[PDB]
Amino acid sequence: LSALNPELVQAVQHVVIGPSSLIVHFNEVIGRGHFGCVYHGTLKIHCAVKSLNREVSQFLTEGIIMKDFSHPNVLSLLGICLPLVVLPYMKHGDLRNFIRNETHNPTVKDLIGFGLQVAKGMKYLASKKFVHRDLAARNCMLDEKFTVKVADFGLARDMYDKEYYSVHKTGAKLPVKWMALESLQTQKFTTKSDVWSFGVLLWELMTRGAPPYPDVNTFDITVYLLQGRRLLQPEYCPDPLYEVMLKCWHPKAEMRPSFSELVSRISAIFSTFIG
Numbered sequence: 001l002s003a004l005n006p007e008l009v010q011a012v013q014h015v016v017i018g019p020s021s022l023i024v025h026f027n028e029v030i031g032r033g034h035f036g037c038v039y040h041g042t043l044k045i046h047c048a049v050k051s052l053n054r055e056v057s058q059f060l061t062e063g064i065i066m067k068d069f070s071h072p073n074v075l076s077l078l079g080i081c082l083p084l085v086v087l088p089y090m091k092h093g094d095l096r097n098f099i100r101n102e103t104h105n106p107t108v109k110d111l112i113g114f115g116l117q118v119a120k121g122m123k124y125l126a127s128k129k130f131v132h133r134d135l136a137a138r139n140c141m142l143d144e145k146f147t148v149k150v151a152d153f154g155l156a157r158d159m160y161d162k163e164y165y166s167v168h169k170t171g172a173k174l175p176v177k178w179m180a181l182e183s184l185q186t187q188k189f190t191t192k193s194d195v196w197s198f199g200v201l202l203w204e205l206m207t208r209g210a211p212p213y214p215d216v217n218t219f220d221i222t223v224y225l226l227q228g229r230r231l232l233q234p235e236y237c238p239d240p241l242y243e244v245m246l247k248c249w250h251p252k253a254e255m256r257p258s259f260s261e262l263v264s265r266i267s268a269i270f271s272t273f274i275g
């Protein structure tokens with residue numbers, strides 16, 4: 001109902017996909033989230049179609065807001081099929097699996113570049129006052145040109161790897177090993193807590209997808225961090241990039257670099273490498 005919407009009525013025509021335009025292939029699964037499976041689709045362009053099972057006014061507004069976001073390093077929304085979430089197909093899947101995959105071998109320069117692309121995507125999102133809440137390598141994806149896109153947000157938001165989410169008093173399922181100290185304490189999320197997660201993501205990139213804090217159990221991470229601890233420097237992580245990570249994990253949220261600063265600092269480090 002258009003009356004239930006604000007003044008975003010004129011935008012509904014652009015976000016809605018007619019069921020005649022979309023072919024969905026329920027015999028080929030390309031992701032399993034807690035809210036539903038995602039399937040190959042044809043819209044002629046290749047797409048990913050997300051099922052939602054395991055207010056309509058609010059669902060449409062979320063889609064309208066999301067479709068307006070456009071950056072080469074942010075996963076776009078193609079539209080909603082009245083429902084089914086229609087996303088661009090990502091040939092190379094999520095970033096964590098890609099870097100753990102022994103088929104491909106990114107160089108250190110390639111890995112830093114993935115980091116830089118994430119930073120640009122987050123710089124965009126931050127400029128729109130959008131807090132991600134769940135930035136991690138598992139939640140970024142690569143397309144056919146190996147272009148990295150910040151994903152897992154808006155209508156695409158889900159837990160795509162349940163192992164890394166812990167049940168809280170609140171009952172909330174939280175990615176504790178990617179969370180800023182203050183978020184673990186208050187469960188509030190800010191752009192500055194996204195910056196903390198970004199630091200962990202950089203660590204993931206430089207270890208080619210190692211799990212962070214393996215010998216720490218769940219919410220004991222707060223105890224671990226408060227002992228005066230941070231993730232160790234990976235072998236092939238350049239010294240200045242480790243300094244960047246430590247800045248992302250500053251105990252004072254407001255002292256952490258902006259995503260704009262991260263793009264600048266990382267572009268510089270990236271530029272020193274060949275191949």
Ligand SMILES: Oc1ccc(Cc2nnc3ccc(-c4ccccc4)nn23)cc1
Nearest residue numbers: 031048089090094138139151152156160
């Ligand atoms: O080709 C595509 C496939 C799935 C999606 C949905 C989606 N949106 N955001 C995210 C973030 C992570 C993952 C994901 C998928 C598999 C394994 C681990 C994580 N999926 N995802 C979009 C396009």
